[PDB]
Amino acid sequence: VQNIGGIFIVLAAGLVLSVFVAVGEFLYKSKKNAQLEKRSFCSAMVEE
Amino acid sequence: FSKPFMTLGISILYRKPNGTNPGVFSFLNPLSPDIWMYVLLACLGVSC
Ligand SMILES: *[C@@H]1O[C@H](CO)[C@@H](O[C@@H]2O[C@H](CO)[C@@H](O[C@@H]3O[C@H](CO[C@H]4O[C@H](CO)[C@@H](O)[C@H](O)[C@@H]4O[C@@H]4O[C@H](CO)[C@@H](O[C@@H]5O[C@H](CO)[C@H](O)[C@H](O)[C@H]5O)[C@H](O)[C@H]4NC(C)=O)[C@@H](O)[C@H](O[C@H]4O[C@H](CO)[C@@H](O)[C@H](O)[C@@H]4O)[C@@H]3O)[C@H](O)[C@H]2NC(C)=O)[C@H](O)[C@H]1NC(C)=O
Ligand SMILES: CCCCCCCC/C=C/CCCCCCCC(=O)O[C@@H](COC(=O)CCCCCCCCCCCCCCC)COP(=O)([O-])OCC[N+](C)(C)C
Ligand SMILES: CCCCCCCC/C=C/CCCCCCCC(=O)O[C@@H](COC(=O)CCCCCCCCCCCCCCC)COP(=O)([O-])OCC[N+](C)(C)C
Ligand SMILES: CC(C)CCC[C@@H](C)[C@H]1CC[C@H]2[C@@H]3CC=C4C[C@@H](O)CC[C@]4(C)[C@H]3CC[C@]12C
Ligand SMILES: CC(C)CCC[C@@H](C)[C@H]1CC[C@H]2[C@@H]3CC=C4C[C@@H](O)CC[C@]4(C)[C@H]3CC[C@]12C
C-alpha cells in the first residue's frame, strides 16, 4: 500500500465525483420535465 | 621431496546455501497479500 497506493485514492476520487454528476443529471431530467407538470417533486418522485 | 604427483591449492570448504524454490503460487508475489484483497474489494466495490 506504500508502493502503488494512490490509484485507490483516485478510485475513491472519481466515484465520489461520479455520484455528484449522477445527481446533476437526475436533476436535469427534473429540469426539462419542470416545464411539464411541477417544479421539482413531480419529476423527482416519479423518477425516485 | 620428489617432483609432485598432484597439484594442490588452499581453499575454503563451506556449505551451499539452500535454494528454496519459488513454489507454484509464485505469481501472487509481485503484490502484497493485502493489495490482492484491496483489488478484490475494489471490483466488489466499484461494481456495486
Ligand atoms: C538449508 O536450509 C535449511 C532450512 O530448513 C537450514 O537447515 C537448518 O536450519 C536451522 C536453523 O538455523 C539450523 O539450526 C537448528 O534448528 C533448530 C533451531 O531451533 C532453535 O534452536 C536453538 C535453541 O536450542 C537456537 O539457538 C535457535 O536459534 C532456534 O530458535 C530460537 O532462537 C533463539 C536465538 O538463539 C533462542 O534463544 C533465545 O534468544 C533470546 C535472545 O538471544 C533470549 O536470550 C531467549 O532467552 C533465548 O531462549 C531460542 O531459545 C530459540 N527457540 C527455541 C524454541 O529453541 C535446533 O533444533 C538445532 O539445534 C539446537 O537444538 C539441539 C537439540 O538437542 C542441539 O543439538 C543444539 O545445540 C541446538 O541447541 C539447530 O539450532 C540447522 O542446523 C540447519 N540444518 C542443517 C542440516 O544445516 C539451513 O540454514 C540451510 N543451509 C544453509 C547453508 O543456508
Ligand atoms: C488482478 C486480479 C485480482 C483478483 C482479485 C482476487 C485476489 C484475492 C487473493 C488474495 C490472496 C491470495 C494469495 C495469498 C498471498 C500470497 C503470499 C503467500 O504467502 O501465500 C503463499 C501460500 O500459498 C497460498 O496460500 C496462496 C493462496 C491460495 C489461493 C490462490 C487463489 C488465486 C486468486 C483467485 C483469483 C482468480 C479469480 C479472479 C476473478 C475471476 C503463496 O506463496 P508460496 O509459493 O506457497 O511460497 C511458499 C513455497 N514454499 C513452501 C516451497 C517455500
Ligand atoms: C464493499 C466493500 C467490502 C465490504 C467488506 C466485506 C468484508 C471483507 C474484509 C476482508 C478483510 C481481509 C481478511 C483476509 C486477509 C487475508 C490476507 C492473508 O494474509 O492471508 C492469506 C490469504 O491467502 C488466502 O488463502 C486467500 C483465500 C483464497 C483466495 C481466493 C479468494 C477469492 C477467489 C476469487 C474471487 C472471485 C471474484 C468475483 C467477482 C465478482 C495469505 O497468507 P497465507 O500464508 O496464504 O495463509 C494461509 C491461510 N490458510 C492456511 C487457511 C490457507
Ligand atoms: C454535466 C451535467 C451536470 C450536465 C450535462 C449532462 C449531459 C452529460 C447529458 C444531459 C443531456 C443529455 C442528452 C439528452 C438527450 C440525448 C438524445 C439521445 O438520443 C442520445 C443521448 C443524448 C444526446 C444525451 C447525452 C447526454 C446529455 C448531453
Ligand atoms: C472503493 C473501495 C471499496 C475500495 C477499497 C477500500 C478503500 C477505500 C480503502 C481500503 C484500505 C485503505 C488504505 C489503507 C491504508 C492507507 C495508508 C495511509 O497512509 C493512506 C491511506 C491508505 C492508502 C488507505 C486508502 C483507502 C483504502 C485503499
Helix, strand counts (H, E) of chain A: 2, 0
Query: Residue A28: helix, strand or coil by DSSP?
Result: helix
Ligand 2 binding residues, C-beta < 6 A: B 20-21, 23, 25-26, 28, 33, 36-37, 39-40
Measured CA to CA, the distance from residue B36 to residue A12 in angstroms comes to 17
Measured CA to CA, the distance from residue A40 to residue A30 in angstroms comes to 6
Give me the resolution in angstroms, 1 decimal.
4.3
User: Are B40 and B34 contacting, i.e. CB atoms less than 8 angstroms apart?
Assistant: no
Which triple of cell numbers denotes residue B27? 505469481
Q: Is B41 exposed, middle or buried (0-12, 13-18, 19+ CB in 10 A)?
A: exposed
The residue in chain A having the minimum alpha-carbon distance to the alpha carbon of residue B39 is A8
Measured CA to CA, the distance from residue B13 to residue B10 in angstroms comes to 10
Measured CA to CA, the distance from residue B34 to residue B38 in angstroms comes to 6
Cβ separation of A1 and B42 shorter than 8 Å? Answer: no
Q: How was this structure determined?
A: cryo-EM
